[PDB]
Amino acid sequence: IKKGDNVKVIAGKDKGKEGKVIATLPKKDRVVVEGVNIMKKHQGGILETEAAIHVSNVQLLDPKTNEPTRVGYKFVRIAKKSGEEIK
Amino acid sequence: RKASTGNRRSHALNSTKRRWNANLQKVRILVDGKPKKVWVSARALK
RNA sequence: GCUGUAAGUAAGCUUUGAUCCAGAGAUUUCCGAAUGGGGAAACCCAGCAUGAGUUAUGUCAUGUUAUCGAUAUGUGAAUACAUAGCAUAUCAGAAGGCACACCCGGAGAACUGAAACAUCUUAGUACCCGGAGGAAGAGAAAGAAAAUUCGAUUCCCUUAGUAGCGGCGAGCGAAAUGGGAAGAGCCCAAACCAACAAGCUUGCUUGUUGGGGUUGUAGGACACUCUAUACGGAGUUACAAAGGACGACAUUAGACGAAUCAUCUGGAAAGAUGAAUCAAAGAAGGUAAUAAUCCUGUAGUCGAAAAUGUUGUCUCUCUUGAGUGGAUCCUGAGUACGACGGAGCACGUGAAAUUCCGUCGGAAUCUGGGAGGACCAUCUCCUAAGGCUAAAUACUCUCUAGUGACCGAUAGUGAACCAGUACCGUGAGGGAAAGGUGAAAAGCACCCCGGAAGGGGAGUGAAAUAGAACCUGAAACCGUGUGCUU
RNA sequence: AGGGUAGCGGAGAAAUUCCAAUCGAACCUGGAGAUAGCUGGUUCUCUCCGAAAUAGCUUUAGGGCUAGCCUCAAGUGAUGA
RNA sequence: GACAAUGGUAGGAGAGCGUUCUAAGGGCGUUGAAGCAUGAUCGUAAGGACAUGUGGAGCGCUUAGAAGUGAGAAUGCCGGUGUGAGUCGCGAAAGACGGGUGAGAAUCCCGUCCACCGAUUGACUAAGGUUUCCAGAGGAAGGCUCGUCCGCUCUGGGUUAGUCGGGUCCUAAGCUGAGGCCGACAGGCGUAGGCGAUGGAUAACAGGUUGAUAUUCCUGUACCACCUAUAAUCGUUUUAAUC
RNA sequence: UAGAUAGAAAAUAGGUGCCCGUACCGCAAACCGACACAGGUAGUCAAGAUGAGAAUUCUAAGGUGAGCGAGCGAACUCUCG
RNA sequence: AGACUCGGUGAAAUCAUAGUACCUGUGAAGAUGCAGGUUACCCGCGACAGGACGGAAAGACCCCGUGGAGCUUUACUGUAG
Ligand SMILES: [Mg+2]
Ligand SMILES: [Mg+2]
Ligand SMILES: [Mg+2]
Ligand SMILES: [Mg+2]
Ligand SMILES: [Mg+2]
Ligand SMILES: [Mg+2]
Ligand SMILES: [Mg+2]
Ligand SMILES: [Mg+2]
Ligand SMILES: [Mg+2]
Ligand SMILES: [Mg+2]
Ligand SMILES: [Mg+2]
Ligand SMILES: [Mg+2]
Ligand SMILES: [Mg+2]
Ligand SMILES: [O]
Ligand SMILES: [O]
Ligand SMILES: [O]
Predict the structure, then answer these.
(1) Vertex B29 angle, CA B24 and B35, to 5°
(2) Alpha carbon A69 to chain centroid, angstroms
(3) CA-CA distance, A53 to A12, in Å (whole number)?
(4) CB within 7 A of strand G (chain B, 3-42)
(5) Coiled coil: which residue ranges (chain B)?
(6) Rounded distance between C-alpha atoms, residue A63 and residue B23, angstroms
(7) Which of A43, A77, B13, B24 counts the most CB atoms within 10 A of its CB?
């Protein structure tokens, strides 16, 4: 439900980090974001592409802090905890 | 009607088993109220 | 975001709202009841009409073409009459399929028990056939019973393994009174009238509609008195007659849906440690390890353009309802009953009622007839010989939502996986074995030997003695070496 | 080569021979987990007691029933040896 | 503290252990569960703890309840592994040499010689099987050995008809069989007609050609039916040409 | 012949001509026989010398060398003289 | 030709554990496994075949079963016709 906005990945390899997302993959439920870099290899010794994680993620717009995203009233449109700006 | 009718048991004088018919009476006639023919009983032809 | 499982590549689509979800509609090749003919199922061959293309034939497109019956026609003649038949047209008719379930009916067994067996039981089971339903059957007293009588049927309990049947052995087995679930009662036939009909005896009677009328404490007819009036009404489309309008509710896609931060360990926390929060929501599952406060979610609330289903009120239809008197008539005929052989009633021919079957004989008409377990009498009760009937009940091929002191891969469906498969058999038919990498494919770049396979190294990863015949990896079995010994 | 007859049956120059490698009555499914007085098999320890192989009857003698002979819990109460 | 008993099958009575699950309570667990393995340990027994290694996520304990509750033996079912055994066999048969290939050849290709069948181990078709056919690669298993090869795998590719066998022609045996006769239902019989060839009738030959097709392709030469176009014969639509 | 129907077409030119099957083995390695199995598997052609002859012996046509072999040359079994 | 040695490939019915003598005796009354004596260094290979009451086949003979089928008859009871 996300198309390249901000997040804070909290509960994975290394946390406290943020970044912006690529394909959400609705079926596998796995998003692509800067924060994991597999050492893939083809015939280079390594490749350093970008890999995915399950949704252990959260958004942050006004508080500059993770909150439970909360799609609220119809004006649909997002309406977060403390502040209500677009997703 | 033309049916083996009443198919049940037949006891002997000491009551062994045996199946029978009681094949109901029917004799054929030029019917006296319609010019065709068909099996017909006697009990009706009184 | 998408182009299934099923990777991958390339081409492309998509806020001008894809894909996806739900409802309606359109298509829906061929075989198959198969239905124009034929046929070794999925092929072949035709016919007629119309219409494509040819100069023309060959060739094609669509439509149509079976049987049976049941209606309307004509036509029919072996014989003149005119029927049998014959050609044509109409029908949303039927045929078939199935859920091996539940129901009714036709037919209908044996092993077995009996300590053997023929009566018997198993059993009126199985399978077979047929029919219909979503439930069926039954059914509104020619009962049950013996009193302060009740007044369709069915099912559950109980009476009762009692009373009884029985080579009186095996064994079989009610019913009633009573307590409960559900509760519903109605139309014909007949005697009477009108109409039309052949015999018109110019006598009226039979043939067909409409009325008329439906019963035991007798009733109707017929005669008489009032109600109603084309309706005051009851109507009740689930029986009782068969048609149609218009609101509410549920179902088939969905949405909202309260709440947490940090330290240590870790590859990774959802754990320990602390301090905090929501609760109509601490059900559940997933999330790199065990989470009410990360996601899906739940409590609760909202929501349907269209379609369906059930319910409601006006339309809608359709309808007279009682009473007395009983002079005269009517109350279901080759029926009921008897005998003869049989079956079934818990009941084996027994004293054997009551009910059904076949042959044969053969009653009565309300001062009548049947039952009350042989049969007669008195008493009591009921009125066949015509028909319909919801619910209570039995089952679940299937769907929705749920559950388990149920199984967790030799268990459980035979079947967790590409199974009624491979396979076996001519054929009916019988029938297998086989789950798991890791959190994520990050699925071993690169060097080396090697023809390859395979391997040693280097690296991905916490771990590759997790490296695809990939979690864990026992015992048998096989080896390599070695302390002691021969 | 194409066809027929099908098991309570058929066909048989007849032997109880053939009927999809089987025939003193084929084959598959269902009744059906048929029946068996017969054989075979019956899963974890200890403690206490402890037999019989006889009588009778048995279309019975390798089975059964009753009495004997055992065990357990009550009762009797010195009756037993 | 004394006294006495304590072999034991069928079998009777009694007390007991552990497994799976449930309920409740209280506890353990990445600072490594369960299981597994090792061990010189506890208990009278069935059995249970402990330490260590491997293992990588759930488990114990007390009280009680319900059980598909225990397996050495069924000529038991299934699975795996041996024993026999590197033992019998390797499915009639005459091969040898050279040259190539290849990582590697008694077995593969090439040739020369030799031997064998020859009313045939030859050539052609039917039934039958279903792509085995041909080319190019490959050798994991199959081949009763080896294999650089195959009828095995992988990729690709191959079957041509107016005259041929057959259908649009016929029919027996037999099968089906409108109406119809019979039967408890099912269904059974059977006329009309219809299907059904191994038979009857039926218009074609020779050569060439591909790694793989041949009366099918081309090359030449022929035939039957049919339509269209054209004219030398007909003359009531009779009869005559004519169907 | 009943019947159709005005009234042909000699030989000429031109064209039209459907479905199935067709590969391969087919006394075999490919069919039935569970096997790349010493079995069966209808039919057609079937040459040469010798011979009555499709017999027999040896060869054409053409096809094959049989899917384990090398040693030694004992028992024993089998096949032949 | 097989067998036998070398190379290649590589089964089976069977199988309580085994480091598996003989005699005379005992014994379920015919012993590798017991008692008493006797002789015999460990391990092979090729041959024979007395024993392993050897294997294969829940004994085809005999008997039992209140087992079963087929068949006969002036056995019973019934029956189609
Ligand atoms: Mg219909
Ligand atoms: Mg009688
Ligand atoms: Mg009668
Ligand atoms: Mg397992
Ligand atoms: Mg014979
Ligand atoms: Mg049994
Ligand atoms: Mg006793
Ligand atoms: Mg075992
Ligand atoms: Mg050479
Ligand atoms: Mg063919
Ligand atoms: Mg052969
Ligand atoms: Mg000759
Ligand atoms: Mg050897
Ligand atoms: O059985
Ligand atoms: O059984
Ligand atoms: O049995």
Answers:
(1) 135
(2) 12
(3) 8
(4) 10, 12-14, 16, 18
(5) none
(6) 102
(7) B24
Cα of A53 vs centre of ligand 11, distance in Å, is 67
Which stretches of A1-87 are assigned E, i.e. beta strand?
6-9, 17-22, 30-33, 52-54
Of B31, B23, B2, B24, the closest CA to residue B45 belongs to B31
Separation in Å, CA A59 to CA A1, A25, A44, A55, B44: 11, 18, 36, 11, 99
Nucleotides of C under 7 A from a protein CB: 1-2, 15, 83, 106-110, 118-120, 124, 255-262, 267-270, 287-288, 291, 293-295, 334-335, 341-343, 349, 357-362, 440, 442-446, 459-461
Q: Please indicate the experimental technique that yielded this structure.
A: cryo-EM
Q: Are B5 and B21 in contact (CB under 8 A)?
A: yes
Residue A9's CB: how many other CB atoms inside 10 A? 23
Question: Token pair of A30, please?
Answer: 């796995």
